[PDB]
Structure 1
Amino acid sequence: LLAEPQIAMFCGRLNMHMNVQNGKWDSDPSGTKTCIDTKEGILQYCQEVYPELQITNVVEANQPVTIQNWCKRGRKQCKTHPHFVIPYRCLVGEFVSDALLVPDKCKFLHQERMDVCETHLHWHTVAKETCSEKSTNLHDYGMLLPCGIDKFRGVEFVCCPL
């Protein structure tokens, strides 16, 4: 969901966050906060930047975005080269899994491993690998059953014809 709460980082520039009202990337309120290394720190920035929301978890978005107007410290020189970055989604309150679009001719699948607690990458790879086994393409996917910070017990996905 391209306009939901989320943050985007580019080291050397101020963090961006999604403006849910207009869909645009807004720079850091303080004019000082830059890129973060830990998922836990990303959760903390989510919480700081969306004070009216209860941020309970985070997850990688599935596709990178392009952002060109990164600000330097103190919010000026807010132009640089276009930069590809995968935003982190700031997940709100009780977990609701993504409603995936399933084009005609494609197939919705889901797998749950209630005995494991796994990464976004792992589930992405499970999804992709499943589709590939039948000569189809992974089209859209989402996490299921959070069990930790950016850790989940399952994946929902859509496989489409090549």
Structure 2
Amino acid sequence: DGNAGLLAEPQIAMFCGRLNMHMNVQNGKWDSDPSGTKTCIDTKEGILQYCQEVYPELQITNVVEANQPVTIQNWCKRGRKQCKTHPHFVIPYRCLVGEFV
């Protein structure tokens, strides 16, 4: 079973020119890049590394594209500032937790 007390699954969302977003599993909201500097990544390995960076304690071992597109409002385009605009939608990547054997 999963944790009902956590509104969402770990995921990252990218849109080149803007800061990467990730899902806050506690509240179900998209949070901006923790360092406030990282934008889109073009390799699967780079995405996995990023999942591991923003979810350091989740033991993320793989990533896969999500099935549904998602809209994110007022996306952060730099710093952790300058982020009030029209909606954009992207297909997120799910950060998958492996079961270690």
User: Which category describes the TM-score, using the shorter chain as reference length?
Assistant: 0.7 to 0.9
**1:54-97 CA deviation, whole Å, 9 max, x = no partner?**
0100011101000112112211111222111000000012xxxx
Distance 1:82 1:2, change over 3 A: farther
Separation of aligned partners in 1, 2:77 and 2:38: 10
In the TM superposition, what is the alpha-carbon distance from 1:22 to its structure 2 partner?
0.2
SS at match of 1:3: coil
Separation of aligned partners in 1, 2:93 and 2:34: 18
Superposition CA RMSD, Å: 4.4
TM-score for both structures, normalised by structure 2 = 0.87
Bigger radius of gyration among the two: 1
Larger fraction in strand: 1
Aligned residues: 96
Distance 1:2 1:18, change over 3 A: same
Runs of 4 or more, structure 1, over 6 Å off, are none
**1:85-144 CA deviation, whole Å, 9 max, x = no partner?**
000000012xxxxxxxxxxxxxxxxxxxxxxxxxxxxxxxxxxxxxxxxxxxxxxxxxxx
TM-score for both structures, normalised by structure 1 = 0.55
In the TM superposition, what is the alpha-carbon distance from 1:157 to its structure 2 partner?
26
**1:14-68 CA deviation, whole Å, 9 max, x = no partner?**
0000000000000001110000111111000000000111010001110100011
Separation of aligned partners in 1, 2:100 and 2:44: 24
Distance 1:34 1:2, change over 3 A: farther
Separation of aligned partners in 2, 1:157 and 1:54: 9
SS at match of 2:50: helix
Q: 8 Å contact 2:7–2:25 — kept in the other structure?
A: no
In the TM superposition, what is the alpha-carbon distance from 1:2 to its structure 2 partner?
7.7
Q: 8 Å contact 2:61–2:97 — kept in the other structure?
A: yes
Separation of aligned partners in 2, 1:83 and 1:44: 24
In the TM superposition, what is the alpha-carbon distance from 1:3 to its structure 2 partner?
1.5
Separation of aligned partners in 2, 1:45 and 1:58: 10
Separation of aligned partners in 2, 1:31 and 1:88: 19
Distance 1:45 1:157, change over 3 A: closer
Q: State the identity as a percent.
A: 100
Long gaps (5+) in structure 2: 1-5
